[PDB]
Design a protein around this ligand. Structure first.
Ligand SMILES: Nc1ncnc2c1ncn2[C@@H]1O[C@H](COP(=O)(O)OP(=O)(O)O)[C@@H](O)[C@H]1O
Lengths: 496, 62
């Protein structure tokens, strides 16, 4: 007998068609079964097995029925309306181009918005097997974990990297190589997808090889529903217990959000849910009570005391201190710029991000007040006998640096004129020497996160109005958008 | 038999004319097929293949 058949037999199997390989196959095969398992006989010994799984024949046969899919996406993700409309485009388009084409997409946005899930779900629809392949530091493995050559790889994180192009280049991806196994391989039918946050670290080379989709974040409204129709049941079922075991009243869910999560995704949200799913169960086993109802009063008896503040029931107006809406890699955020007055020379030194991008803007809001002075109420003998300190907290992403113009401006004035920025207002906008207010980036996410921390008024660029259209109903409804074109406009509304 | 021919054969092939190279060719070739695929026998093992494709006479009638 001998194991000279156990392998060989399944080798000539229907699996393993291509002969370009079978050469190298029986080659290292008819090798040295002579002699026993020497230190040598253990080597190539294994080389054969990795080689046995690498799919060839098999390959999911695919179903592409939009009427479903599009509304299977609506079974496992709440909102993302616009993001789906673009997953289907990537299919209705697929169906025609019978062979998947180079442009493979990256999903981008704050973590916890569903990037990973959308993928799994893209694949559920295509009935291809799905594989996560983390790139925090090798497709080699990939296929194996799916012994079916028509998969969906999800290059999870391409941006926590320290060049691989070869693997995706439409021209080359067809013929695929890999050391320690050197032999071409066909990846024709392989739906590739990428996750990502800070679109920077991604290599320019790659970002062009790939088509991008942005998942955005979520309105209180949205989250809430995500909690009710997906998040909760999922955690219930996962902490093994019944829907009849624990229910949380809407208002409490809202509370969990406003007060224990200031994220744009829903990861923190999920975690606090579980907190309860957990607390819940220990009851169900001991007390045995078949039901547990967490309410807006109970909440503390589950997830602790409040964690973030929401609104102005606490804060109270300040001087030379404005709250600018900035575009963090992780959503809208509320970084506050400050300005301080110490005797000296016209020089101005700023802190925080070293910012060479900032100085330009700073010494412009500066170079504005330089002009229109008495007109603003401030001793013209100032740039001559004061020294101004500015602090611009890190977070805003590169493109959006100059979007803090009207902010530093507003502060520098509020600081010089002993006035006071209205704690309620959040602002964003680029400044010019003359005092012009130029267009800004991502007003959507900005006001989204402006609402999250619960501000009232949100001063922004006039030439940005056609951007308010796409701001989700719920938030555009709790905000009074003051639009402006020159400082004085901003100053009049943000100071008191 | 042994794979002592699978490669060698296609080496003396019409492909691989220039002799300035063939030296370094059969050189690292008549190397150490002795012994088995040791941690060593995997090294130069491949060095030969990259060398097999590199063109030497395939001119495209312009
Ligand atoms: N819109 C959404 N619908 C359903 N689940 C969501 C949604 N957004 C986030 N989640 C949570 O995350 C999982 C899928 O999203 P997730 O992968 O966490 O976002 P990320 O991809 O950044 O982690 C779900 O199991 C759920 O816990």
């Amino acid at each position: 007998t001998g194991e000279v058949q156990t392998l060989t037999e399944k080798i000539e199997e229907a699996g393993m068609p291509d002969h370009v390989k079978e050469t190298a196959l029986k080659e290292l095969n008819r090798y040295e079964k002579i002699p026993s398992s020497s230190a040598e006989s253990s080597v190539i010994r294994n080389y054969i097995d990795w080689l046995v799984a690498l799919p060839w024949t098999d390959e999911t046969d695919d179903k592409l029925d939009l009427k479903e899919a599009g509304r299977l996406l609506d079974e496992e993700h709440h909102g993302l309306e616009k993001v789906k409309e673009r997953i289907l485009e990537y299919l209705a388009v697929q169906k025609l181009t019978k062979s998947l084409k180079g442009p493979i997409l990256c999903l981008a946005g704050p973590p916890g918005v569903g990037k990973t899930s959308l993928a799994k779900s893209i694949a559920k629809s295509l009935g291809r097997k799905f594989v996560r392949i983390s790139l925090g530091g090798r497709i080699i493995q990939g296929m194996k974990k799916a012994g079916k050559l028509n998969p969906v790889f999800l290059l999870d994180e391409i941006d926590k990297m320290s060049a691989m192009l070869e693997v995706l280049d439409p021209e080359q991806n067809s013929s695929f190589s890999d050391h320690y196994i050197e032999e071409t391989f066909d990846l024709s039918k392989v739906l590739f997808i990428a996750t990502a946050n800070n679109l920077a670290t991604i290599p320019g080379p790659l970002r062009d090889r790939m088509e991008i989709i942005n998942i955005a974040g979520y309105t209180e409204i949205e989250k809430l529903e995500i909690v009710k129709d997906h998040l909760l049941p999922k955690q219930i079922k996962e902490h093994g217990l019944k829907k009849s075991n624990l229910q949380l009243r809407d208002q409490a869910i809202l509370d969990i959000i406003r007060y224990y999560t200031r994220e744009a995704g829903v990861r923190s949200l999920e975690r606090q849910l579980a907190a309860i799913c957990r607390k819940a169960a220990k009851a169900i086993v001991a007390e045995e009570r078949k039901r547990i109802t967490v309410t807006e009063k109970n909440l503390q008896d589950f997830i602790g005391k409040r964690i973030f503040r929401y609104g102005q029931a606490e804060t109270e107006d300040q001087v030379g201190v404005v709250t600018g809406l900035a575009y963090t890699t992780v959503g809208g955020d509320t970084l506050s710029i400050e300005v301080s007055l110490s005797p000296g020379k016209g020089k101005l030194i700023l802190t925080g991000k070293l910012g060479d991008v900032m100085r330009e803007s700073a010494q412009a809001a500066f170079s504005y007040v330089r002009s229109k002075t008495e007109e603003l109420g401030i001793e013209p003998d100032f740039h001559e006998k004061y020294d101004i300190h500015i602090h611009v907290p890190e977070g805003a992403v590169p493109k959006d640096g100059p979007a803090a113009g009207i902010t530093m401006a507003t502060a520098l004035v509020s600081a010089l004129t002993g006035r006071a920025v209205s704690r309620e207002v959040g602002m964003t906008g680029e400044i010019t020497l003359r005092g012009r207010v130029l267009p800004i980036g991502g007003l959507k996410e900005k006001a989204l996160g402006a609402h999250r921390a619960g501000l009232t008024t949100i001063i922004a660029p006039k030439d940005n109005e056609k951007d308010i259209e796409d701001i989700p109903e719920s938030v555009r409804e709790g905000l009074t958008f003051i639009l402006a074109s020159h400082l004085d406009e901003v100053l009049e509304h943000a100071l008191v």
